[PDB]
Amino acid sequence: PQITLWQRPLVTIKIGGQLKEALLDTGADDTVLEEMSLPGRWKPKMIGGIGGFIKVRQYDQILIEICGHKVIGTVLVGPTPTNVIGRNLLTQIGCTLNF
Amino acid sequence: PQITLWQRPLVTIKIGGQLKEALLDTGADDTVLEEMSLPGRWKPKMIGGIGGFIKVRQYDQILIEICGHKVIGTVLVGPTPTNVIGRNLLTQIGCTLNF
Ligand SMILES: CC(C)(C)OC(=O)N[C@H](CCN[C@@H](Cc1ccccc1)C(=O)N[C@@H](CCC(=O)O)C(=O)N[C@@H](Cc1ccccc1)C(N)=O)Cc1ccccc1
Numbered sequence A, B: 001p002q003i004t005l006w007q008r009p010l011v012t013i014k015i016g017g018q019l020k021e022a023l024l025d026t027g028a029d030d031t032v033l034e035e036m037s038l039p040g041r042w043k044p045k046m047i048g049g050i051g052g053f054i055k056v057r058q059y060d061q062i063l064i065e066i067c068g069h070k071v072i073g074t075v076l077v078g079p080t081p082t083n084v085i086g087r088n089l090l091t092q093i094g095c096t097l098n099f
Helices: A087-093 B087-093
Strands: A002-004 A010-015 A018-024 A043-049 A052-066 A069-077 A096-098 B002-004 B010-015 B018-024 B043-049 B052-066 B069-077 B096-098
Touching: A052 A087, A069 A087, B052 B087, B069 B087
Parallel strands: none
Antiparallel strands: A002 B096, A010 A018, A010 A052, A043 A052, A052 A069, A096 B002, A096 B096, B010 B018, B010 B052, B043 B052, B052 B069
């Protein structure tokens, strides 16, 4: 649908059998979720943002359902304040910015 | 216009007589620009993101031109890696997310 930005653009996602709330973030190349019990294999990685760098576990080919659209992609899990849905998944649901 | 997210959503902004490139960020409540000389007064503030917290100077009623749309709002200046245009200005140009 069309979401305006007067409030934070939060959506419901279903990942790993669990329901969560996530922020649609055009300024994030990657999708980062707060600590979570994910299954499968992974590899370490570091990401940066406004205040510095954090270490996250990187899981590939993870099924995630965002506002009803299923997509499969990489998800990073670590000590992030909020769950963020980045461009790697946003392109997958054909999300665009319009003005 | 309509901007897809296969690449980072960077735009040209004009602020303080200077031209810069900034990232349209739906996941940022605020607009943060790298170090730059701005006129007018200000007050200290701290902001957080993935990574931690940074200190920025906060200037109000600043004219900024984003892809041709002039808007007046608060701008925060400090040690951010990239220039980020947050929701405080994005609502001003009537920017929406669509999918
Ligand atoms: C700028 C202010 C006003 C402080 O807001 C946020 O940080 N907002 C966060 C959105 C994040 N948007 C961008 C802003 C940005 C962009 C470039 C540079 C610095 C900052 C971001 O950090 N994006 C990260 C998200 C994590 C990720 O994508 O993996 C990113 O794309 N980082 C890249 C680019 C990068 C590399 C090195 C250093 C810094 C950044 C990366 N691959 O690590 C959301 C949030 C909500 C609640 C609490 C805290 C934070």
